[model samples]
Target: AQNPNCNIMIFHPTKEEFNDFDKYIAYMESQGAHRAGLAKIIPPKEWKARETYDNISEILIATPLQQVASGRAGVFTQYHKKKKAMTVGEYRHLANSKKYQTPPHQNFEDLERKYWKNRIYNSPIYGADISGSLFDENTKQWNLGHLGTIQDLLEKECGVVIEGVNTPYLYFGMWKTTFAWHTEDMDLYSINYLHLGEPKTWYVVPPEHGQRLERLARELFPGSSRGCGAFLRHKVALISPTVLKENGIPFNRITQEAGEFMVTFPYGYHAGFNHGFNCAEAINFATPRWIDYGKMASQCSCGEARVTFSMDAFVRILQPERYDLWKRGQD
Candidate 1:
């Protein structure tokens, strides 16, 4: 819900962070360790998000195993591939199929290890395992304005950063390769870079409604409502937006095009799917707000238990700033 009077917040006039990379990373260290939001970041033409990939014809390798988000609960799963690797076009060709379908409630985790053991093209691409760095070179091309992220600030301060938390990961999808509903790790922030692709449609539940969405997910998928992630080989396969809308939950939808970036906020439940074959990269980081939340998430997995970062370590590195707020507070 857009707070009509949010502009009247007792404290206003705060909008931007440090513009310089070095300064921004430092700023995030003390003031930011946990934070989340959703937005688009466009870089200078020189960043070449889409241009560089096409030019290089970067070949993404898929091993004998691939992770998939399956069925209409959208069970995520890990599967093996008979082929060694696949080109983007070829993978898409294989992905565009209905035979890949399985009636989840029946004999499988949707299809069980037995059935899914055979599904390929109809399956999803485990882009996270691509074992290389497209995000690096492309991000290198970014001018300070675009590359200047809060995590960049944290990484410089801590000397260590988690990929999804402080760094990014790559994503490739075809047709229904879907992502299930979930929030970022330990309520940290996530930024996605779509270098080039057909298009990715995003469904976002406002931060205010995040908890409510989680409840709805449980109500819809009872047995598996306990955790969340990318639905990586994992509950959650509904026509998300419409399901939420029908439940009277407010949400927003958008399509990310080539060379666009999408930011997900802490505690905001989001999910989306790719329309055609596409290539993209995503990473996670922390903001000041996430500092405390990450600590709490550890005990109960407030953010996807699977991807939560270490609040203690982050704080230790984050402390010694003032009273070493972290040390004095708990640590």
Candidate 2:
């Protein structure tokens, strides 16, 4: 599963090139990098986050999941039946403790069978919104919150703060912990920066094939899809790459290493699992072109989770520079 025929463009930008995040991403977009739904950016080697996590002692709760390769839910799905609460330092310490590496059964088939029936839970930290915590105070140049395009403009005009959309949300992952296939809020662009630790394996379907995957998902989970118009927003259904490929859906697999960034384009469907322990931060952003995409994405909600901001309000408050895009969107 590590090696795939199709590749996600990995750009190794120089320090100067990396300075203007938008420009580099625009260049990739021009080159049709968005066709793969997402791309990887490895910043110049010298760049690094400025702050240390010594003082980040906030307690965060994480859900447990049994890791297994084959299942309707793919590698793992959130098990809300149990929860583990631990401090940031304690979480990292536990992940680094080399305990999760050992499997209960020595035999491969026995191990698979054990987990296939029911297995002990591995509580992995993920989607932890640490925006208001001490992590928010860190003045990292590559902070996803500060790098958004329309987010800055909207905040300047509307004075609105949408957590995890404009602001950053930190994520922690351990081996086999997976994030299900889902588009960014409002189908906006998303950028994830791996602060430190092991690599993340990402599988993304092309924006064009997003509908095909959704159709298959509906076929697979009819009840969920019928109940919620925005079923994928639930982020629990995980389809394997083989399933996508067998159904003629195009996809690209990419590995995001530490100090690198992964950018998911508008309407892209992406899912992934971590190789080991890792900490990453992510946020959603919208370019001028996203105005149209955002308009179409107004239907993005599973009743529980909805779009972070209003497209009409944003376009109304948007500066004159994006007047043409907004005008076209209305027409």
Candidate 3:
């Protein structure tokens, strides 16, 4: 019964705020040393590599359920250069090398093998054209000096206990090019922050109007599904191109500086095409907990699918029966 939207707060920091790499480093340090919650710190020269961290910045507040990339196993590449083509073994070596000061828990070899095997043996959602290590060159390697130091500093500043199971941050690095259809899921409050280059086109559809948009996407792009996660819900939000067209949710271009933005559903069925020139690096954050009615309804439509549960199931795995009393008030 209550609205299913997050109390979103947007803070836009100017380039000048991060102009001094040391100042940014200090700020992250002061936030506590917890790697999960420390805000990302990128120096001026290494700013271009911001895309490497991708969605890690949000781990400070949320958790990822099925992250495709993590540790040293998830790194990969889209470029054709040979030197750029990194493997899990090489990635692990790089992470362990004294030059980077990698965290103790970063099991480069194990993660790399898991992710590579997932791509080769498991379901191929995006295909196998792309390949690389889980270690993101953009952030980990590019900003090694400041980024690593800042992360270490943040780990100490936050003082929050981050257990392995509940750690807020997850890392994913995609080697091949890929496209995700418009759909939402529970638990993730998707935030897309551009670090490398601007997007040429971006589209957003509100949750109230998602059904119509989902129908349209199915009709227009038959094989495509809704949401990046393959689930029936659309929990993602659009941060770029502040405004999108009303008709057919056409892709329109908008310009924004390098900073973070929050996207919430009813306002999120979005898509974007990278301008050939822009590298299009971004950080997408989502919690394992969220509330989106449209996603619940869509899942229920499938009789075989268990519809008795709510979005909370993804966040908190307690039996659906436990929430019966609270459901009425929430609905």
Candidate 4:
């Protein structure tokens, strides 16, 4: 089937644009970085954007399918076997300790064993995937990939730039049966293409009107945690495109065109679901630059993984300046 016509504004660049990263970057700049948000809020408006003609100097696609499965099952099975051996408090304390560091360099088997032996064995969210490691370095946090790589891709591929960074790569992967709805800080963008399996229900609600929905969901459900209240405060939405457009925001349908890409503007407030019983796959691409945590002083800072594996093998690559950012983040 062809792509659906949701109210979300979408810009489809010619195949040639994708081939030349510089042209793509120039095109993105023509859209006016500051005005990108306007397009996001206005809904379905097409703008004449410049295209960058340069190619990315480095390209890296981190596929987490293998790690995701191992971590999911290993955490659950190990947790159950060890839960009866410890108290809830004891389990939380241990999981929160630094003894469970699952660095990216660690083999998959070792990472799974450490996670099961430490965190998931006794928690209410048992059998749940531990993604904190993919976002933050704290025992309870996740760290997915280096922020440098994200920044490099964006700047080199799209010509968008950001400042005062914190972490890299917005974390989005199927974790057991749940997914994360975290937002990027400051100026960053992400395009997630559902590559395989059933269509997931996606929703986007503007922050301005979200409070009312949250209150209504709570009042109607009355102590029921399964209603809209669960996601009211979250920047994600599960509503239809019609509802999203009513709130004055564009709701674009992301297609599964193997090579097709979507560009998520910064702070767009979106969410998606698998809506299926089987496993699914998606490719998340982003631009501008990832956040630099070492330069910031936020106590709530999350840790990023180093990009030791070669990113050069990918179909596209980022420029030297952007690649430098990725290298510095690992130091």
- Tens-digit lDDT track for model 3 on 210-240? 5555554444333324322233332222222
The lDDT per prediction is 0.49, 0.64, 0.31, 0.31
Residue 234 deviation, candidate 1, in Å?
Answer: 5.8
Candidate with maximal lDDT: 2
Candidate 2 has its poorest 10 consecutive residues by lDDT at 67-76
Residues 294-325 of candidate 2 have per-residue lDDT tens digits of 65663422344433444445534433455354
Clashing pairs in 2: none
Q: Which window of 10 residues has the lowest lDDT sum in candidate 3? A: 123-132
lDDT of 4: 0.31
* TM-score winner: 2
Q: 1 in model 2: Cα distance from truth in Å? A: 29
Model 1 agreement with the true structure over 1-331: per-residue lDDT tens digits: 3342111111111123313433443343233221222555554443454335654344654652344434443233323344567665555556555543222344212222322233323555444435334653444442322444445546664456634223445566655455656666445667677777666777776665566665665566554545532231132344444456678866766667777766666666677666556777776655555555544431222232222244455534444342243334332
TM-score versus the correct structure, for each prediction: 0.61, 0.75, 0.35, 0.34
Q: After superposition, how far is residue 260 of candidate 4 from its true place, in Å?
A: 4.2
**What is the lDDT, from 0 to 100, of the residue 261 in candidate 2?**
86
**Model 4 stretches astray by more than 4 angstroms:** 1-7, 25-148, 151-181, 185-187, 205-260, 277-331
